[PDB]
Amino acid sequence: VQDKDTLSNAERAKNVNGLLQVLMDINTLNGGSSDTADKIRIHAKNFEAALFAKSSSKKEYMDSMNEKVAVMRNTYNTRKNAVTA
């Protein structure tokens, strides 16, 4: 649009990197572990493509990924919390 369309490659490497770390975190906790690489691969890729393609602006893009990682990462520490506790 104006800021989301003028985005650089940095946001791409960061968005995926962050999403992968989170997605893989919950996917590794009890999402498969072995098939994780595959899950996070398609999940992250499809995610970045969804938030980016649906990105309405620089604020919508960051809020999109930040939301997916916040919810995913949270479920990882929340679900594992009881397991470790």
Side-chain angles (χ1 to χ4, degrees):
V1 189
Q2 313 174 33
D3 317 314
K4 64 89 144 218
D5 162 47
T6 191
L7 296 170
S8 353
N9 244 237
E11 306 209 357
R12 318 187 172 278
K14 160 143 77 149
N15 181 36
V16 170
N17 180 267
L19 282 170
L20 210 98
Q21 300 247 129
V22 162
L23 271 45
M24 83 181 194
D25 243 330
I26 185 180
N27 205 287
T28 295
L29 149 60
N30 190 246
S33 325
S34 307
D35 276 35
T36 292
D38 259 297
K39 288 134 188 281
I40 317 316
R41 166 139 146 196
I42 59 95
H43 283 324
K45 267 52 144 73
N46 192 353
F47 261 126
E48 62 171 320
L51 49 100
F52 189 105
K54 301 155 99 244
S55 106
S56 218
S57 216
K58 59 180 246 255
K59 53 248 296 225
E60 254 95 330
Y61 175 90
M62 59 188 207
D63 190 45
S64 278
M65 54 102 105
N66 180 25
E67 273 173 327
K68 293 298 97 102
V69 298
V71 63
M72 283 293 222
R73 198 188 158 78
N74 273 13
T75 26
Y76 158 59
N77 228 63
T78 284
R79 287 250 170 187
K80 79 192 218 71
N81 249 332
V83 180
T84 188

